[PDB]
């Protein structure tokens, strides 16, 4: 296992415009388009990302070429941010994968409210950063996920996963 199988299992794959677990318009293999309720806004969106006139679907190859540049842009923030890099670079790299993963799904700004998780994360106590995780809206809303995320989180192996 790695990143990109973790992400292609909890995204799956779509190769025409659908709406999200919260309403937004994605493609691919959970490629944000636009917050916009316009699906004219999301078509244009999307033939600027992809480069050519699509009218709502792409194709395999280019699914996976956005998601190749999303999962670097996950990291990329990672790295850049002051808070989450000291985090990042005290975890081991099954848990790494669990943070990429969090970040994919709510950007930077989602994971600003999980300051207290993230101190518990890196002093390694691991049930109870798993318990304070859970305590969100998160997990109320999309529990089967934010169950398989944080049992990486808890014992470091894919078992979730498998
Ligand atoms: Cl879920």
Known sequence: ???????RIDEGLRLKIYKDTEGYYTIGIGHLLTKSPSLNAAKSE?????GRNCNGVITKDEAEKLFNQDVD???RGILRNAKLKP????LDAVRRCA??????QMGETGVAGFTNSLRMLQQKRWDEA?????????????????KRVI?????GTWDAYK
Do not use: H
């Open 1 to 7: 296992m790695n990143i990109f199988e973790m992400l």
């Open 46 to 50: 999307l033939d600027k990302a992809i």
């Open 73 to 75: 842009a996950a990291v």
């Open 87 to 90: 985090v990042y670079d005290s």
């Open 99 to 104: 943070a990429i993963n969090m970040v994919f």
């Open 130 to 146: 798993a318990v304070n995780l859970a305590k969100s809206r998160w997990y109320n809303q999309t529990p089967n996920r934010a």
């Open 151 to 155: 049992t990486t989180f808890r014992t």
